[PDB]
Amino acid sequence: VDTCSLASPASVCRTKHLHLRCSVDFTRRTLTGTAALTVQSQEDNLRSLVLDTKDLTIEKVVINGQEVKYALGERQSYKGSPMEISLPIALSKNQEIVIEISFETSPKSSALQWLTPEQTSGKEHPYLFSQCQAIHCRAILPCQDTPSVKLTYTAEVSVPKELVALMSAIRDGETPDPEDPSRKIYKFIQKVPIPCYLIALVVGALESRQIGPRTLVWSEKEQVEKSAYEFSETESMLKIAEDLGGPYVWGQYDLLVLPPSFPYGGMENPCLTFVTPTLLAGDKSLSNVIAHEISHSWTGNLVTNKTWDHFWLNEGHTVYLERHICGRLFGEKFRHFNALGGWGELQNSVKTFGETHPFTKLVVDLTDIDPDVAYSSVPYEKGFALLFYLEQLLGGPEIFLGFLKAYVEKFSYKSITTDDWKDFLYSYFKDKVDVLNQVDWNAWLYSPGLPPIKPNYDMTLTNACIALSQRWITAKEDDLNSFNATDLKDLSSHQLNEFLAQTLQRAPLPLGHIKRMQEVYNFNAINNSEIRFRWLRLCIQSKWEDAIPLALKMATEQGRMKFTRPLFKDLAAFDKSHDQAVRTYQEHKASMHPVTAMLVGKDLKV
Numbered sequence: 001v002d003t004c005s006l007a008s009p010a011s012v013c014r015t016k017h018l019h020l021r022c023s024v025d026f027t028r029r030t031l032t033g034t035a036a037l038t039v040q041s042q043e044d045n046l047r048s049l050v051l052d053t054k055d056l057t058i059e060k061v062v063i064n065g066q067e068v069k070y071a072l073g074e075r076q077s078y079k080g081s082p083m084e085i086s087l088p089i090a091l092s093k094n095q096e097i098v099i100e101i102s103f104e105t106s107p108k109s110s111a112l113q114w115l116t117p118e119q120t121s122g123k124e125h126p127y128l129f130s131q132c133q134a135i136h137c138r139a140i141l142p143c144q145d146t147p148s149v150k151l152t153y154t155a156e157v158s159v160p161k162e163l164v165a166l167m168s169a170i171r172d173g174e175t176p177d178p179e180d181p182s183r184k185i186y187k188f189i190q191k192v193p194i195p196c197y198l199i200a201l202v203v204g205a206l207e208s209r210q211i212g213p214r215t216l217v218w219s220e221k222e223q224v225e226k227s228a229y230e231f232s233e234t235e236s237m238l239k240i241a242e243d244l245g246g247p248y249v250w251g252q253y254d255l256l257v258l259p260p261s262f263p264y265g266g267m268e269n270p271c272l273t274f275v276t277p278t279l280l281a282g283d284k285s286l287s288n289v290i291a292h293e294i295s296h297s298w299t300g301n302l303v304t305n306k307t308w309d310h311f312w313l314n315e316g317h318t319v320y321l322e323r324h325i326c327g328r329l330f331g332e333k334f335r336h337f338n339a340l341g342g343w344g345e346l347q348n349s350v351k352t353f354g355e356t357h358p359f360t361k362l363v364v365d366l367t368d369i370d371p372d373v374a375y376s377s378v379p380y381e382k383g384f385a386l387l388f389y390l391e392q393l394l395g396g397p398e399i400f401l402g403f404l405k406a407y408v409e410k411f412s413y414k415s416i417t418t419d420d421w422k423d424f425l426y427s428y429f430k431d432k433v434d435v436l437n438q439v440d441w442n443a444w445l446y447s448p449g450l451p452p453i454k455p456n457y458d459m460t461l462t463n464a465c466i467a468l469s470q471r472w473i474t475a476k477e478d479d480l481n482s483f484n485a486t487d488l489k490d491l492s493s494h495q496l497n498e499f500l501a502q503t504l505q506r507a508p509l510p511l512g513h514i515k516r517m518q519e520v521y522n523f524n525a526i527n528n529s530e531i532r533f534r535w536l537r538l539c540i541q542s543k544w545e546d547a548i549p550l551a552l553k554m555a556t557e558q559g560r561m562k563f564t565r566p567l568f569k570d571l572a573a574f575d576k577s578h579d580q581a582v583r584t585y586q587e588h589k590a591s592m593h594p595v596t597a598m599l600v601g602k603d604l605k606v
């Protein structure tokens with residue numbers, strides 16, 4: 001059972017389909033309409049069921065054409081309020097009925113960010129986007145808000161006629177709205193069963209450009225050309241992913257480039273991946289995020305974690321596939337470079353939480369924990385590290401990719417636990433059980449801290465990064481003259497980033513060192529978001545007051561939490577910028593994404 005959901009579990013009843021009919025009201029910042037849930041009883045004599053809700057106003061519940069009794073329980077913090085519905089006729093096992101709930105969202109919906117025209121590229125029209133993962137779908141519509149249940153869906157969405165609606169589904173046409181000529185209705189169909197966290201909606205002044213046989217990129221007009229170029233490797237990556245994972249079942253693979261406040265690098269919404277505009281580096285160098293989102297089309301969207309305690313199944317396997325895609329495109333030495341960088345990020349995460357912290361376990365226990373507070377690189381990188389270690393134990397990448405494909409095929413359209421995964425690993429590799437039994441399963445799956453063993457990494461591309469980082473760390477004042485722009489001449493953007501990551505792991509450095517780094521490398525000029533993030537962190541941690549306005553600007557001009565949270569935290573930790581950091585958060589809080597505002601507030605103790 002799912003300790004993050006208040007709804008009836010899958011063992012009691014299962015939602016098979018959602019038909020959503022709604023209207024997006026920008027004047028009120030509300031979504032209003034009806035959610036018709038087709039529900040299948042899993043029990044004899046079923047007379048009631050419970051759904052998740054969060055800050056929803058319920059008008060009525062209709063079954064068999066008549067209003068029925070319901071009750072909203074008390075709010076249980078971030079979990080929201082349970083909604084018990086009294087069924088008019090007792091159901092037999094496997095009987096299906098349709099329950100139509102009339103509802104309206106709150107402007108404060110934690111699933112939604114409502115943007116004013118000023119907050120968009122075009123400055124004329126407003127914009128709305130959703131982000132349900134993990135447990136925010138209940139803040140859009142009443143549902144069994146657990147990934148243990150998979151449903152198909154159809155939707156009709158009425159929007160102001162100058163705007164476009166898109167969803168995690170196949171577009172099924174548009175018409176003027178008969179109830180309001182100032183509006184358009186956009187229709188959508190998702191015929192593959194999905195967990196509700198994958199329900200997504202965007203409304204805005206959107207344009208599209210074709211970039212491959214099954215891919216359009218969508219954004220505001222101002223970003224279309226740059227996005228088409230940035231993500232032009234998409235089809236090549238989809239082809240490799242199909243080779244590794246099996247058939248792509250979702251029809252199209254479109255991309256949507258969101259406004260800068262989108263809180264994450266990407267979200268693998270089926271048919272329509274959402275990405276941060278912080279990927280728009282100009283040189284395709286941050287395309288691994290696209291590889292990651294593509295990979296979720298198998299690991300996550302087809303094979304799904306049964307509860308959020310098992311989130312590493314989604315992420316570890318996706319990072320594993322991501323790094324294989326990038327290895328195929330750019331070589332095995334590059335895969336190792338990225339794998340080793342990932343271990344570095346895991347080191348950082350473990351150090352941040354502390355080596356005994358429960359959020360550093362691979363399988364977590366989210367009982368009475370807000371999923372958004374637990375979120376970190378751990379499931380990604382500790383999960384990847386386990387799979388990479390197993391690859392090395394079991395005879396290499398060709399062999400292990402055989403397992404991955406078989407795993408996806410075995411559990412397609414299902415929701416599974418860590419034990420399901422482990423049982424299948426043992427089944428697939430039955431002739432290697434002696435090797436499998438050498439793994440310290442209790443440590444890897446259930447213990448906090450760094451894994452009990454570190455995999456073997458090729459160091460070829462990393463060596464120059466470490467060498468230069470070490471030169472800086474061990475430099476004394478009289479060595480600073482020796483550094484020069486030529487030091488960087490043979491380093492790729494990825495290597496510059498890794499040099500900064502290595503150096504940040506030892507921060508602070510002396511202020512004069514950091515001043516010299518700017519003098520000779522001109523890192524202030526680099527617009528690549530990953531590099532700029534790490535550089536500004538290094539500058540702030542090393543107490544360079546000149547970097548304060550730069551870091552405040554980056555923290556607020558975009559909202560990807562990977563960057564915004566640590567920049568604010570670093571600015572708060574620096575005495576010279578502390579008061580400004582707090583004031584800046586206070587001033588921006590009302591117009592921030594609701595989850596980002598919550599987490600930055602928590603980080604700052606404000």
Ligand SMILES: c1ccc(Cc2ccc(OC[C@H]3CCCN3)cc2)cc1
Nearest residue numbers: 133134264267308311371372374375
């Ligand atoms: C370990 C850490 C967090 C969680 C809960 C969780 C899972 C996914 C989440 O997704 C949020 C963003 C990540 C990228 C797009 N969605 C958030 C919280 C479970 C295990």
Ligand SMILES: [Yb+3]
Nearest residue numbers: 171172173189
């Ligand atoms: Yb159609």
Ligand SMILES: [Yb+3]
Nearest residue numbers: 476477478479
């Ligand atoms: Yb010296």
Ligand SMILES: [Zn+2]
Nearest residue numbers: 292296315318
């Ligand atoms: Zn992911």
